A paper describes a structure:
PELP1 (Proline-, Glutamic acid-, Leucine-rich protein 1) is a large scaffolding protein that functions in many cellular pathways including steroid receptor (SR) coactivation, heterochromatin maintenance, and ribosome biogenesis. Here we show that PELP1 serves as the central scaffold for the human Rix1 complex whose members include WDR18, TEX10, and SENP3. Mammalian PELP1 is composed of two domains, including a well-conserved N-terminal domain referred to as the Rix1 domain (based on homology with the yeast homologue Rix1), and a poorly conserved proline- and glutamic acid-rich C-terminal domain. The Rix1 complex is a large and essential molecular assembly containing the conserved PELP1-WDR18-TEX10 protein components (RIX1-IPI3-IPI1 in S. cerevisiae), with the inclusion of the SUMO protease SENP3 in mammals.
Single-particle reconstruction resulted in a 2.7 Å resolution map composed of a C2 symmetric PELP1-WDR18 heterotetramer assembly. The refined structure reveals a highly interconnected tetrameric assembly centered around two dimerized PELP1 Rix1 domains, which form an α-solenoid structure resembling a horseshoe. Dimerization of the two Rix1 domains creates a hollow core within the center of the tetramer. The two β-propeller domains of WDR18 sit atop and sideward to the dimerized horseshoes. The C-terminus of WDR18 threads through the center of the hollow core towards the bottom of the assembly. Our cryo-EM structure allowed visualization of all eleven LxxLL motifs and one of three PxxP motifs embedded in PELP1. Seven of PELP1’s LxxLL motifs are localized on the internal (nonsolvent) face of the PELP1-WDR18 assembly, while the remaining four motifs are solvent exposed. The structure of the PELP1-WDR18 subcomplex revealed that the majority of PELP1’s LxxLL motifs play direct roles in mediating subcomplex formation through hydrophobic inter-subunit interactions between LxxLL motifs and ordered helices. Instead, this supports a mechanism in which WDR18’s C-terminal tail plays a required structural role in anchoring WDR18 to PELP1 and then fostering PELP1 dimerization through “capping” by the β-propeller domain. Interestingly, each of the four solvent-exposed LxxLL motifs in PELP1 had their leucine residues buried away from the solvent surface, most of which reach back into the PELP1 structure to facilitate α-helical arrangements. Therefore, we reason that these PELP1 LxxLL motifs are not compatible with steroid receptor binding via the AF-2 mechanism, raising questions about PELP1’s ability to coregulate steroid receptors in the context of the PELP1-WDR18 assembly.
Numbering used by the authors:
A (entry chain C), B (entry chain D): 30 to 46, 61 to 80, 85 to 280, 305 to 411, 416 to 470, 511 to 561, 566 to 638
C (entry chain A), D (entry chain B): 3 to 246, 251 to 257, 262 to 343, 395 to 401, 407 to 427
The structure:
Amino acid sequence: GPRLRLLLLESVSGLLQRSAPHLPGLMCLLRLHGSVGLSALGALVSLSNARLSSIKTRFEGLCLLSLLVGESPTELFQQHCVSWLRSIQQVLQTQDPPATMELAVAVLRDLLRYAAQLPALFRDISMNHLPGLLTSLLGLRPECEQSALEGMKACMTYFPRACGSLKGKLASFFLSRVDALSPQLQQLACECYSRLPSLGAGFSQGLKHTESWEQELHSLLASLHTLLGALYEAHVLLQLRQRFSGLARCLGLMLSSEFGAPVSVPVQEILDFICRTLSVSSKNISLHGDGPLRLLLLPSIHLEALDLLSALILACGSRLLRFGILIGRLLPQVLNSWSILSPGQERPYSTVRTKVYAILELWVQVCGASAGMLQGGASGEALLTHLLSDISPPARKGDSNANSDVCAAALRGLSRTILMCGPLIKEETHRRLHDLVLPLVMGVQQGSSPYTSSRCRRELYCLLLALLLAPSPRCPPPLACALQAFSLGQREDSLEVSSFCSEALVTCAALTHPRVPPL
Amino acid sequence: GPRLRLLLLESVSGLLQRSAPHLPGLMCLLRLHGSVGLSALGALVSLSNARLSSIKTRFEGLCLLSLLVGESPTELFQQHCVSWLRSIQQVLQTQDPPATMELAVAVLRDLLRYAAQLPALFRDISMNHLPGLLTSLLGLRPECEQSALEGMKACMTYFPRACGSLKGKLASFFLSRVDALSPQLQQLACECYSRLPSLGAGFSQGLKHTESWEQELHSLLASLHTLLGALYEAHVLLQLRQRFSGLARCLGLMLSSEFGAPVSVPVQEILDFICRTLSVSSKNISLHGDGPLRLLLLPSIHLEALDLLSALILACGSRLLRFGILIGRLLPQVLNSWSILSPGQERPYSTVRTKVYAILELWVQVCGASAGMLQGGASGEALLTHLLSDISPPARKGDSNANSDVCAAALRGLSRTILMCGPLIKEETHRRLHDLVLPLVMGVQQGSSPYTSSRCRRELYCLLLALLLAPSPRCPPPLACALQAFSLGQREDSLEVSSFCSEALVTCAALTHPRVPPL
Amino acid sequence: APMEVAVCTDSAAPMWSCIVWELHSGANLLTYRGGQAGPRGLALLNGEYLLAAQLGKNYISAWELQRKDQLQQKIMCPGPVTCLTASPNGLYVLAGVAESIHLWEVSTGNLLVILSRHYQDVSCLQFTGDSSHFISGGKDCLVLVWSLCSVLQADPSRIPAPRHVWSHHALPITDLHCGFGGPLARVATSSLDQTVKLWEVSSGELLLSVLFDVSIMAVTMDLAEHHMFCGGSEGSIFQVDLFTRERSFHPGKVFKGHRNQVTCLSVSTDGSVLLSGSHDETVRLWDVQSKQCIRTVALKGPVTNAAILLAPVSMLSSDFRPSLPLPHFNKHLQDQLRVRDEVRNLRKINRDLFDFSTRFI
Amino acid sequence: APMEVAVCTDSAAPMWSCIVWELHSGANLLTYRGGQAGPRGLALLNGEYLLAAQLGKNYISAWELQRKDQLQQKIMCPGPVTCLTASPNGLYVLAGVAESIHLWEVSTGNLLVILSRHYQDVSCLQFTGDSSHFISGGKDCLVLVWSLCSVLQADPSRIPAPRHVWSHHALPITDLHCGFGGPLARVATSSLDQTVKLWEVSSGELLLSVLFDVSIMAVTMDLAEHHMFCGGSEGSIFQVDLFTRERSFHPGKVFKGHRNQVTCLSVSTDGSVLLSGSHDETVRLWDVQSKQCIRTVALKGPVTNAAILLAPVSMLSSDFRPSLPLPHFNKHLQDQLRVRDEVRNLRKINRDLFDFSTRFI
């Protein structure tokens, strides 16, 4: 050696002062060698500071300081972190191009992450520097607002207590950006706004933090209800749609992000809001005035409600078991809302159906065998009919892999549901699945179908293995036909399909050659 | 509816002529509704052409034409494809900002993909327009060179025969960019250059194409050998490194890409080159003059050779079985070359080891039970020792998930190798794996270790299931302990780990409750 | 299996009510005092709380794993508590209150449902591995299998019904054991009719039935279900090999050394070590292979509870505190939770950093 | 199972040498003429070529699946060819030339290795499902299990050795059948010593041995290995249930209707239909459940080959041509291939397009 490579870099740094474009490659090589992790380190630090001092070589010094922060020894880091932080803060107010600001913010995020784990350095950095760093981040140019957000995020991730004094001001910086047409800026603003309740001291074992979190969630729910009522009552409709999406994404991020203190999650209120959003399908809108614009905007509102439901499911887990009835009534309702051809082409509303099937898969994942999916009732029957319609192939301009992606999502949902709830599932469902899937796997190996994509074939083989693994106790699965299908698929050209078929054949050998006598 | 939404968009297009930022969102909604994919379509086409005619509203018309090409009916597309192509070509020579050029190139790629599948339209577009489109793409500004490449790629993907007349010129455009410090530009240039042998008529069932492919491969091998000999003989060393990486990536792309005609792949020559590249580990370089720079550059050369080996494995499949001895001697040699601490921190040369383990996993995937890995000999023993060292946890500034990623790669390789070759593998290997893995899975649920990442825990549970599924016939696997570990992991907070443990428990129930008597 | 521990309670409880001691060491890792836990009335909630149904009382006491005499608040019940269990995921608490089953959710403490399908007092409650189903046995000689989904999602107008009703036993059920899994799990029941029955949860079928010459007061199986250990009413433990509907055990497969009825049976994770608590005021530790008593521990009264379990970080860390406090469990018929190891790896952060560096260039 | 077909060859072959006909229809889907294929000498290479070891000759003929009389080039061998097989992946061709096994790679046509471990003529060659191992049986009463990895990666100085040598049979081997899988596969062998043996490939152990009163000339199993069908030397097919090391079959499990020795046995994918070719110049199609002859097809000579297999797109598409020509197979001791369905999906292209559109803004 490390000393030899470090001395090499110090000596051949004279190319900079032209190997500036080569500097990132050399720097990746230096961190790959692990030479950093001390006269050589001190010389590198001094050269980095000298480069940062100038206004034309700031990129080189910033890269050097990025490497230093990345792989400093715990001794060098403690003694030089304050100087590096001051240099980064000074660079953050230089009227530099936004790429320099982005690099400085990334380095600052690394520095703050590595400084928060040193109790002696943490408190010093916090009290003596964090308000100034936040003020500098708030003072960036509009063109660099994106960068500022990451910096703010960093300050709110590792130093939350010291961000409280400016918390309200930070809020003014976030509401302005949650209604932003740029998806990355809007997502980052939502992520920053979701961290507001965690700022401050949080006295009494985070009681203040819990109260702030609950108040923010209730305010977001009220605002979402007002926006939804306004939407369902030209440019203004688009503005309300954007604000609704931003607010709902903020609420979903608050649901599905780490928080310091325990909180009380109102499940009934969020579920009532989701149902209210999903309860306008196609006919309540009608067609008059701005009615067609509402009809155009409706799938985006439905997708945003589905994202909210996904976040709630992730946050709560199996605790939503007593609302599973509502969830299993909601899923086929959304499927019925957006269901509508020539072979090939593409069915409309495919994204909404994929989101619904992902919701189904996630729900089965978090609820295990208690998900209660495809287990009787009108809602389960409707969901199964939609799934079987979306996985069936459609039996001149078009795509060879037509409707492949909804097919793959439905296959994933069906295979997970079968693997986890197959014994509980009725035998007619299993027989229908066999009669639909066995000809499919036999015919994919032997036109324009969803199964021209290898991912769909992999999901179909996964569903076949799930039917073998979790069958009805009263309906034995077709083992020989599935074995033939797996043998055919292990000779397929696609690597993922053949590999899955090999592993599935190993599992089927376990299934076919028992090790202990049965009972 | 569709007619209502299309008429809506036509009427509320007066916002453009300000909802221009809202136009992409409206356009995504329009393609999600499936309203396109015919008076409304004709009006939309006319409005798009009018917008493209002006120099300030070109983005709006380009977006509209993108949607039209995306979801046109096969009747409208045939009648308007020539006009859309001419408009795109006209836009491609306008001295517009590079974002407009990128959008136009994306739309052109979609148009060419959808036009090549219509035999009547294909030949007309080809002969009457493709040379002019290629000339326009070659004539773009340097700042838009990136964009040009995609366009060229499109022209070489769907209209290869008509690109032959300019093929040589295209080559001059690609060699200049394969030695490019921008990773995206270099990758795109390599992808474009790998398509050169497929251009032209290709007479005699692609005999000319096969000959051109073989000649290009041999020329690339000779150039790579010359570059490697020069490297192992300041700024010039970096230039040769960049050229070596570009040429080797071109060769790997030629190996692992679709080609029209059958070709003869020289496996011995490429393997000899890979071995020659990998045969300089640490001591041949020494330390004098530019020696340390060669030592710095060496891991990148080794990684590029490993990428070449990966491409060769993907291209050839199980046909490399008779070179598997060389492959299994190479892998532990590279592991020994880059092996070097305090708990936590990070081991150096981690990327090279991850690449080696990915090579191992891919080799097992393509060779099945014939991979012959960990099945006796010094090379297999060395590989196993390296794997077990890289998956063992290391039993103040640092990362909690230290060395997690090499651990995950080694776990994936080990689990795939066990699942596919476990019965052939000796029992002492299985016992060592049990003694190392069972305490690990029991202790992850109960400091700074690689297994603080959920992905490593998921891979460890996958390895446990592989040991259960493919054990030695003479060494029974520990079933009760693995069941306890899976039960503990299904209650883990991480969703992926708990879901995998649930599915693994279903598989273990299949393994524990036989359905037929044994033999 | 890092430090398997044995958790034992007796009836007298002069100075200690519960004792946690290492299997191979025998030293008292942890102690708890305050009451007298009843049979089948000991549970670990979420690996962080110790719930004990008080013997002959109408309430359930709670302890923290790291604090002695940590009895603070009680779970009031309308009648006497006969059995108590917690779901392995730690989300629900079941108590047998007379002939009924009370279900509480640990998230809110609400009394979710009172199932009154048994016409006699409930003797034992068990969960499956994944908490999808729970099995109840009572002195009504019935074994009821309840789907948690059906029980939780029931309109109070239509009372929940058991997924399965099993009435093959002729005398009151004394113990239940559930294997790993959910629908694919198997349940072992033992009765005073000298019979141990193995059922399949999903099909509801009777897989096996073994008859003994004495009443079977306890039953358990190893995780791999290789064997089945049945503790009788005369201090004799029988081992039945599940590798061989309607058998009839007849007397090398029996453990000798207990004097009074063996009421608690537990098997270590590896299945080589067996724990047995009896009414002779003794907990014995046996080698499964050699049928030899490894260890004998004397208590001050008849053993009511005894189990082998993997010690969580709670029992090992002397500074452990529960993440959430125990809620107030309502006596009559949002979610409190912590919202939230997917941290970016090392080439994750490095690839982000060099993407930024390249984007500068 | 879309259109399972039966591929049959006889000895006389007056006008047709090979016939492919639908199982449930019986109409000749395809025909081939030119020679007389020998026993065990019929193979399908890569689902696109038909290789036939000529009866009593030193060469192997080839046909394209869509062309009659498509005999063009021959695989010369130093001696007479007794058996012929191709790996299921279509990469290798094995031929039994006298006492030796010649291995060719279809990619280049090179004679990779000549294994001469048998001291008598090789009677039959089989591959496993994943082509990892191949099993050879000869008149030397030996069953040899070869790892393809070991055989291909051998220095010509050190001759390759079998992974397993099985000498439990006392009379020459007449047939081999390999189950699905590689190391975990099972192999059924049948001998003139009236015995059918089931072995495990990995451990090399003998799992089962069934003794009959007549010599067993053919053997096969279904994919799930539920049953085992053994065709004897008197025209009787026996079914042995593998759900029950050393048995002894004694005489409802036997198929009646063949007169001379049954030499070919094949089972449909579902296992409900059995194909049997005999020396009585007849191929019979049986219902497995009812043991009743569904169909009888008369040929012009003793049946040498008969199999049931899923018809590839080659047999269904009348315009099919092989992707690669057959190489020249060298007579004495880079890669020619097509380099390299991962096409971007619909939100793949849409997400790329809207990323571009947003990047403009």
